[PDB]
């Protein structure tokens, strides 16, 4: 039972930078069931425009892959733990604008407590609570 | 009337997994110097390989669901771990280092990369101390808040110095199936890695699969034959690495201009720690050169083959690795016992609309965590003299970016990490089948 | 000489002719005298044992049907209508052995059991008639 | 580049009635689409993955079928717990609006 | 079907009828592909090797008497008065095989040696007569 | 009884008579139940596996020539003039088996291949004639 | 210690005995060990009296 | 009162990642896991 816990809601200003954490725990230790195998996507939900995909971070080597609209202004880092059954995922959006106000979700792709879903990265079951970032003056 | 007739030795096989042992040429290894990948223990391979062609045989291959690559990954991990077992454990080397930068004949490129660190290390007598100094790279030391430093991997793993006589040179190894098992080789020159293979052959051993560990580039590897081959699990999926194979050499010449000297420090009763004492001569940044015209061409072939999957009107763009550790953001490889991390931004950085050499700055690391093992690290001992490499970029590990919804451009950044993809580019044509030589067929015969 | 599995795509007649080539390479491979506990010696021992036991299982299956040492053996169990009933000429002139295995892959166990029962019954019959 | 489009925006229905709504794509995505349920104030929960395969926990009343470009999500025997917002998902692409099931 | 060792307490005739059931389960058990040096993989390898060698020893004993591949084999050595001389009907209608083994436990080796000598002698005789 | 390899220096006739003594001691030696990773248990496991595989290879070579379970087997391939052509009386009255092996060491493989081909051909012939 | 700048000292277990105990080297099945019973054997060349053990 | 003296709050000096620096840490040890040496000294 992988659970993802995010940080609190933040109120920023245009031109600022927000760093949302994402604590993940319960992955497991065995290879294929560890945090160093399951990517942590970052999905933005703007009210009215539906969900939007921002990028995913693979926690083994930190290999990130950002969406085209956000290249140059988004950075993802990891804090994978010792046992590799947990960790923390960060995302920094350094060029916040008025249109970036939304609820940001960190998600993984582990549906079941006993399945190796390492190579199926788009079954986004473990959604985070959601960090409501408000960017306004 | 019909009666059951049992036939023994029918040419029938079924898909199955097995234990694939190793075979290698006797002349490949010097027979005097040991190897991190044990070659002496491998059975001596036959001088003449016995490859048998199978006519009228179409078999379904799948390089992404092949147990050969996983078994090879496990084998390499086990070899690397067992090679470090008898070597020296550098637990005393975690002390508080008094480091000062080396400003003796240093170029501006490597102004602060090297640190002359003096520390106190136990001698053979545990009641006496020793004050010794060593040259550590910037990436191998982290400041503690002259200043105070410590090893980068000293709060996360225990350092084990690699044995100076154990060679890290890749030696070809042939994965051979046991008796009753056969290895099917796909001789199709245009094979996407999945689906039927019209030209299926049978071998007893694989070819010479050099265990070259690398990222962003497949070095010293097996080429394609007709054209540059783009092979991905799902080219639409951006989370799947794109494996590229080159039909022609892309020669890359590495070098380490510093003339490092190895100084042996006795850290215990019979244990020796080899440290970079001094460097004789000028200090220059390690770099790797790649012919500009040969790359720009190779990239032209790559984009021509890539435009097939995405359309002929896309603006294919190559860019440099964004984010990640040093093992992914830079081309990581091993050159003569020293680990290089080269900034392959000049190699990529290019946009393709429908004598000169490229110099890639490189950084050297001595504390290496290869397979991301928890609580395990390795200290590569310094290599005396100037190190030079001449390798062949035989492939790429690319990665498409993502949700470009209406955009016509498709950016392909490099990036490896998973060495199973590195060794998948060699085992894509091979497949292990289990021989079932017992079959029943109907005849008009009658047992008396 | 077509080599190991040379007649895989050939007609079942040619494969029945060349059975011995596949039969030879079922127990001995390229697999010095001493045993080591490195990875490669470990895998070598595992491979040797696996090949030995698989060949022994196949040989036992041959022997308990009274066909030990015979590449082609004639038995006494007929073919039921449930099993594949396609023409003899088509099976033996228009087929490969892989296709034939794929076609009758499920009815293997019951055919084997019928072979066991017939072999045991005819052994009893031979022992009884030989006592006279 | 996939332009996932889900219609209709809303679907009012009574308890026990079956509902259907489609997520039309632009190109061939085989059967690599996933269906989600977004209850008001709660995180999205997967309904159907790989086009037809069903999530273990949820009952079999939720059925999703389709291949190629047009995919269909069906909710037979509607109950007051199914009132939520649903949306498809093909890899990194999401529909602009999604379908919101409401009570008649 | 009585299962493995099903006719252990049954008459020797029924056991002779059902020999094949015991014969099948002598080489293959419930005994993934990779070999490990934990306790369980170690014991697994030992068990596989032990089963292989025991089955091979039994098969060799069958074969060197000229009874390879035969569940019931007829030989040419008579029964000495030293060995058990009880009635044929009583042995084959009033006995289990365990009791029969317990009764003639000693003597096994000399019977085996007589079988070896008779098999070799008749092999020589067949080779000599076949040369004519 | 001359023991293991007792007739090594004896005439080939006596060795052909005593073949069974050498045949018995090819699979079982003096080689408790548990497996250990000390040097001696390691070497013991290696020796057991080596003996098993060597005996199985010899048995397979016997069987694929249609001579399984036979100490002396008659075949259908003639003797070419290239192979040793010395007198029958001299070979079978004035020779030891070691000398005979030393004399025809080379050639073994081609004789084995001819045996394979003849066995397969006569298996096909028997299957064809038995269908009538 | 004399061997302290060259090797690491491992104390022998006091209960492990160093007394030589005879050991018989036995060949596996399918292999034989030839014993030369010649009483004047130079270690090389033919042995007229060859035995098998 | 049942577990009055069963638990002992033991503070000791333990090596950190750097062998030349020490660390002062504390732990709760059961009475059966510590024996007095003759606050007091335990091991
Ligand atoms: C490249 O991309 C394609 C397309 O996405 C991938 O193909 C899909 O792979 C997934 C698994 O990774 C398949 O999902 C599985 O489908 C099963 C049902 O499929 C059958 O029925 C459909 C009916 O339309 C047919 O189209 C299909 O061919 C089959 O006949 C489900 O039963 C599976 O669920 C079970 O397994 C999963 C995974 O372990 C569990 O999570 C579930 O709980 C459950 O136990 C599963 O959903 C999908 O059907 C494939 N589509 C195809 C074949 O077109 C490729 O895998 C991908 N990579 C490669 C190598 O090509
Ligand atoms: C991929 O390519 C892009 C574009 O070429 C590249 O981006 C650039 O990266 C460099 C290095 O990270 C950036 O340079 C730094 O910029 C910061 C300010 O933003 C400076 O403070 C840095 O100062 C350096 O030099 C100082 C004096 O020696 C040092 O004291 C200091 O520690 C730094 O070393 C430095 O100039 C550069 O701004 C970006 N610019 C862009 C985005 O174009 C990216 O790094 C490449 N990725 C790789 C190599 O994987
Ligand atoms: C990987 O390789 C990349 C390509 O070589 C590296 O990119 C370069 O990184 C350096 C810092 O390490 C940047 O340096 C600064 O550049 C600014 C901009 O000035 C440039 O242009 C003026 C003229 O207009 C010229 O005089 C300068 O020399 C620069 O070329 C300077 O003001 C700073 O002083 C400093 O030089 C480079 O700009 C940057 N190049 C590019 C193309 O972005 C990258 O750092 C490497 N990183 C690694 C090793 O990970
Ligand atoms: C082992 O030791 C290393 C070195 O001290 C630790 O790495 C450091 O970890 C801290 C977090 O605990 C990192 O801090 C953060 O850095 C980012 C840099 O952009 C900054 O934005 C944050 O505000 C914060 O300061 C620090 O960078 C990092 N240093 C390096 C060189 O990576 C590591 O975490 C230790 N591991 C364990 C098991 O504690
Ligand atoms: C790719 O393959 C080439 C060979 O085809 C590798 O180059 C060779 O690398 C070894 C190890 O660095 C060199 O050996 C050394 O040579 C020097 C000078 O002779 C000697 O002093 C050292 O003791 C050692 O023997 C070898 O010379 C070199 N060969 C060539 C052609 O330069 C290359 O390292 C491989 N690249 C990889 C695996 O990334
Ligand atoms: C380990 O420690 C031992 C004891 O300190 C070292 O042995 C000593 O090595 C030196 C090497 O120069 C020997 O010196 C020479 O001795 C001869 C004696 O005839 C003399 O003629 C020479 O002028 C010179 O002084 C010294 O005798 C020797 N001591 C002994 C054997 O008791 C040993 O070399 C060390 N091993 C190392 C450094 O790895
Ligand atoms: C080697 O050890 C000595 C003694 O510990 C270090 O020098 C002392 O460091 C302490 C640090 O608190 C100072 O208070 C002393 O004044 C120093 N000098 C003495 C005691 O002579 C020395 O720095 C160590 N070597 C290193 C780390 O380079
Ligand atoms: C770099 O690539 C070239 C071309 O593939 C390699 O050269 C070939 O080496 C093989 C094996 O010796 C020869 O059979 C070919 O004839 C060679 N081709 C040419 C054009 O010379 C070369 O060995 C590679 N270098 C490496 C892998 O280090
Ligand atoms: C890589 O290419 C660079 C040039 O791009 C080479 O640099 C020159 O090397 C020669 C010989 O050492 C020097 O005389 C020149 O002054 C260097 N030029 C510069 C601009 O530094 C370099 O030697 C090449 N090395 C390899 C390994 O190919
Ligand atoms: C690293 O630092 C040490 C000092 O900690 C340097 O060694 C000293 O160098 C001076 C100048 O050559 C000598 O007079 C001293 O006798 C040396 N002290 C020693 C050897 O303990 C050393 O040269 C520095 N190395 C580099 C490459 O900068
Ligand atoms: C890489 O190194 C090789 C030598 O190892 C270079 O090859 C020689 O280059 C010179 C100069 O162009 C030619 O005259 C020789 O005929 C080449 N042959 C040899 C000696 O191999 C090569 O040019 C270097 N190229 C790069 C990319 O650095
Ligand atoms: C790198 O430095 C070493 C050490 O100075 C050089 O090798 C020495 O060269 C001198 C002659 O100049 C010899 O007298 C020494 O015996 C050599 N020492 C050795 C071999 O350890 C070396 O030549 C320098 N660079 C290179 C690669 O040539
Ligand atoms: C693959 O199939 C072809 C076509 O059936 C085989 O070729 C025929 O073989 C038969 C038997 O030898 C000949 O009589 C025909 O003349 C051949 N050609 C045709 C057009 O029928 C071919 O032999 C098969 N592959 C193998 C290896 O046997
Ligand atoms: C165990 O023994 C009984 C006999 O005691 C076997 O069953 C039959 O029992 C009846 C009792 O009246 C006899 O008339 C039969 O002759 C017995 N045998 C048969 C073949 O019917 C019973 O079968 C034996 N156990 C097993 C496992 O067979
Ligand atoms: C060793 O060779 C000798 C000489 O050929 C054998 O002795 C003869 O054996 C035959 C057959 O038993 C007898 O008929 C002869 O009388 C024996 N010798 C003489 C005096 O001619 C001897 O048997 C051979 N060794 C063994 C163990 O058989
Ligand atoms: C932990 O280490 C410190 C420093 O060594 C110990 O403190 C010293 O203990 C001796 C005991 O005889 C006193 O004489 C010193 O005055 C102490 N120095 C101080 C307090 O700075 C301490 O006892 C050790 N143990 C613990 C757990 O405190
Ligand atoms: C080494 O270089 C770094 C660069 O940031 C500098 O801070 C430090 O003071 C330098 N050390 C010395 C002693 O030169
Ligand atoms: C792969 O190639 C085969 C032909 O060899 C073709 O039938 C198949 O559709 C191809 N599919 C992919 C995934 O490229
Ligand atoms: C590389 O080749 C292409 C044509 O294939 C050309 O357009 C380009 O200018 C060349 N090199 C560069 C990077 O200028
Ligand atoms: C038997 O196997 C064939 C293999 O193609 C399959 O089509 C068939 O449905 C199976 N049927 C039975 C009765 O097992
Ligand atoms: C050893 O003795 C044999 C006779 O037993 C003799 O032929 C040989 O030449 C001798 N050679 C040596 C090395 O003494």
Residue numbers in the entry:
A (entry chain I): 1 to 35, 35A, 35B, 35C, 35D, 35E, 35F, 36 to 52, ...
B (entry chain A): 33 to 138, 147 to 185, 188 to 306, 309 to 321, 321A, 322 to 397, 411 to 504
C (entry chain B), E (entry chain D), F (entry chain F): 519 to 549, 563 to 663
D (entry chain M): 1 to 91, 96 to 108
G (entry chain E): 193 to 245
H (entry chain C): 148 to 185, 188 to 192
Q: What do the authors say?
A:
Broadly neutralizing antibodies (bnAbs), capable of neutralizing diverse HIV-1 strains and subtypes, represent promising tools for immunotherapy and prevention. bnAbs target conserved epitopes on the HIV-1 Env trimer, including the CD4 binding site (CD4bs), glycan-dependent sites at the V3 base and V2 region, the gp120–gp41 interface, the membrane-proximal external region, the fusion peptide and the silent face. The highly conserved CD4bs is critical for virus engagement of host cells. To elucidate mechanisms of Env recognition, we determined single-particle cryo-electron microscopy (cryo-EM) structures of a BG505SOSIP.664 trimer unbound (2.9 Å) and in complex with representative Fabs from each expanded B cell clone: 04_A06 (3.8 Å), 01_D03 (3.2 Å) and 05_B08 (3.3 Å).
In addition to 04_A06, we identified and structurally characterized 01_D03 and 05_B08, two phylogenetically distinct VRC01-class bnAbs also isolated from donor EN02. The presence and length of insertions in the three representative bnAbs correlated with the formation of interprotomer contacts. In contrast to the CDRH1-mediated interprotomer contacts of 04_A06, mAb 01_D03, with its 6-residue FWRH1 insertion, 4-residue FWRH3 insertion and 20-residue CDRH3, contacts the adjacent protomer with each of its heavy chain CDRs and makes potential electrostatic interactions with gp120 K207 and E64 (99.6% and 99.7% conserved). In the 01_D03-complexed Env structure, but not in the unbound BG505 SOSIP structure, EM density was observed for residues 57–65 of gp120 on the adjacent protomer, suggesting that this normally disordered loop becomes stabilized after antibody binding. Like 04_A06, 01_D03 contacts the adjacent protomer, likely through its FWRH1 and FWRH3 insertions. In addition to contacting highly conserved residues, the insertions and interprotomer contacts of 04_A06 and 01_D03 contribute to an increased amount of surface area buried on Env by antibody binding. Consistent with this and in common with 04_A06, 01_D03 exhibited greater potency and breadth than 3BNC117 and VRC01 (GeoMean IC50/IC80 = 0.052/0.187 µg ml−1, breadth = 92%/88%; 245 strains). In each structure, R71 of the heavy chain contacts D368 of gp120, a feature typical of VRC01-class antibodies and a hallmark of CD4-mimetic bnAbs12.
